[PDB]
Amino acid sequence: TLKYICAECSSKLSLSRTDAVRCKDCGHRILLKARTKRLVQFEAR
C-alpha cells in the first residue's frame, strides 16, 4: 500500500487505512510520507 518512514528509525512501513498509525519497530507515532515517484522538473535558473 502507501509507504511511510518512521521519524527515528528511517524504516519503511506500508500501511492501509485500517492500520493504527505507529512504527512496528519502536512504536513511534510520527510518520513521514514517502517521496513521490512521478518526475519533478526544475529550472536551473
Partner 1 sequence: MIVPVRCFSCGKVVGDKWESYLNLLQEDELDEGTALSRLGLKRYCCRRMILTHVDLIEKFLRYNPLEKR
Q: Which helix (H) or strand (E) holds 16?
A: none
Question: Residues 1-40: x/- map of binding to Zn ion (CB under 5 A)?
Answer: -----x--x-------------x-xx-x------------
36 contributes a contact to partner 1 by CB under 8 A? no
Sequence-ordered list of residues with C-beta below 8 angstroms from that of 34, at least 6 positions apart, any chain: 2, 3, 4, 5, 12
Question: Which residues are bridge partners to 14 per DSSP?
Answer: 3
* Minimum CB–partner distance for residue 10 and partner 1 (Å): 4
Task: List residues binding partner 1 (CB under 8 A).
Answer: 5, 7, 10, 32, 35
